Symmetry: C3
Subunit: 266 residues, 3 copies
Amino acid sequence: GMQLTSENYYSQEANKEYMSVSGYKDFAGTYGKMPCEFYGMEKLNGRWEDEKSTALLVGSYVDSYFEGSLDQFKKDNPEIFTQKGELKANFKQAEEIIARIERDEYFMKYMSGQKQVIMTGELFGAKWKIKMDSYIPGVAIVDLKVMASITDLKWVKDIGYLDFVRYWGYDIQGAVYQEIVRQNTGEKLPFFIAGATKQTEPDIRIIHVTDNYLQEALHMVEMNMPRILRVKNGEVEPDRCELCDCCRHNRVLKKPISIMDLTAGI
Amino acid sequence: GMQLTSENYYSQEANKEYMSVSGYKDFAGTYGKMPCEFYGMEKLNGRWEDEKSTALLVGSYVDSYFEGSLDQFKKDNPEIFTQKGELKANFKQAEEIIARIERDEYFMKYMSGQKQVIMTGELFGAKWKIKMDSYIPGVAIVDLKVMASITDLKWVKDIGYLDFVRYWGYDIQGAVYQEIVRQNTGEKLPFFIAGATKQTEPDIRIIHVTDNYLQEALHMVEMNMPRILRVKNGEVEPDRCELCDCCRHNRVLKKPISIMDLTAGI
Amino acid sequence: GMQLTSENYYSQEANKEYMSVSGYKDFAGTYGKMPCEFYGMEKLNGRWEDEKSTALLVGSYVDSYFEGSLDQFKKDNPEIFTQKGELKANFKQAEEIIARIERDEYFMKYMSGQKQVIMTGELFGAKWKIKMDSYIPGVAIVDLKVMASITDLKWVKDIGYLDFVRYWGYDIQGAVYQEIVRQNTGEKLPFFIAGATKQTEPDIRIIHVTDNYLQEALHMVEMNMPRILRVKNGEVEPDRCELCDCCRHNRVLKKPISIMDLTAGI
Ligand SMILES: [Zn+2]
Ligand SMILES: [Zn+2]
Ligand SMILES: [Zn+2]
């Protein structure tokens, strides 16, 4: 069993040995992003690395501020600065958001736990790994998210308006995080998202994702994992969504499509 | 009774003594912008000033051109120029729009009235103030608006597609302007919006907002003013929409929300 | 009968003597663009030339690469370069797209025909002209299109979701191209769009637009041409959509509109 560390948590070998919330979503998707098994297998092999995104980089900048690892973050990610030397605007806003969080005592209490805590477990067939933004032992699991909007609802076909937690599958993250802590600690802890937005005056909220929602999502994880396990173990060929950048990079045409192909399925 | 002037019309003390069309909307809102009583009270106190907007600044640039006060506008608003010295593109387009207006005789006739005329009155409980772009005594009240689109319709829930006049509450502006002139002049004058757009060839129109629409909106003003008057006089605590920048700047968290809070109301 | 050439195909006199797929759409429109007869007549007269668009210029850059006329394209279109000398980003992406196409053998086979082939014919009242990106004699007519998306469907009122081919009237282009080749060759050839997208990994597809769709569109052309012919021959005054830049440039106001005018037709 591989001993995971801060340096190696995201490693290729860390990801082969341990399913992760992020791993699962590659295969299973969320309301906001189609599943794609191929994409998930190409990431594992190391034959596809994503172009790093402004949104993710903002969010890691802020994680790094709270962990006290900002100097090294900046060193490892020179693309956050202009050629002239100054932080690009999205990051000057990141500091605006941090200051906004810091002047709220209540919000700062949820951020007061152990920082980037790695834990391990067994679920539905595989070993898993988690890494929690702010963990307060015996009281709460907190995840910081920096997003465009907390209050915006999004339309889902045949379901209707959905809040951001269920839409982006943060119900999945909470469920797994909770359960893995439970296998290490015995304690079943509540899950809170500490949200801040990139609006011009940031919106701040602590959002409790209740155990009824965590339970329904841990169930869905259970239903999908067997198919996932089959694909990761070379036991079946992964499907391609044919709608992601990985799919498009790897396509090799052999036949014409027609209009039927564009309108298939309504 | 305070004697209003061009220099002091928008002053803090001018706004405490006089309700205005803009004042009313802060409290009462339009189809395009939620009401927020708090925002309205923080603007009055002087504890919240809005970040000046490109759209508003374009529009004031054009007002200032027609009043012959452009030199001083430019002096008071240095942020309309690049650091290198040139007018930012939105303002180089503003001059494009002005030239487009100027080559239309018909449009120029509606713009030929007295410029930025201040009048005063009494309505539904308070003193009010108005300031009209182009006033032709005994014939018409004209308001210049520079917008994205004249012809675009916008969907309103349980109402359907709405034209820009009703959607942005310019029916309110017209109604009040008309009535206050009527209390000074005796004459009930028609209200026209002289619209130009920021499309790449600007769309130009003179739009008559008829007295049936003005009447229905002056009615709505009447229904809402008592609640407004209560709030401005410290007789009740103002509600917060919790969806504007003022609300967000001023929020002090004390409790967690949940998904119920995000989906409340459909 | 005017002998058309590469140099003169798009000339004012080439367009008076020959209807073209592009000519037809000016008058008849597509699901994606309102018809406007006036616009069509002002383009013919030479009293309206369109501001050249980034999208069209990208697409011509790529045509020019395959024809071996890129040096001269660049000379004739200096606005594709920054003042500092480098290709603007949209064109650095155009080369990315070209390289992506070139590494696909199947796609390159459809691109292997004669390049920018001009043909002429008679249909429904007028002489017509066509110019085909890649023509393989006795096998296929191929048109290269560089677009935002191949898979995106667009909503059309009282019709519903429509694929890009029918939405933008490429069914019209295919139908006419096919028929004119048939009047020169005797051979009825299949029509393929060789599509590539501007997504960050370009989507590539060969799309066969089948003869049932070409037939329904050649029919619509037939129904609309008499009205078109009347307008081009000065036999009736062209209507103005009043929603395009040409219409707006040419408007001369004489009367006020009202809200009825904005909401006419639902
Ligand atoms: Zn995929
Ligand atoms: Zn508010
Ligand atoms: Zn038009």
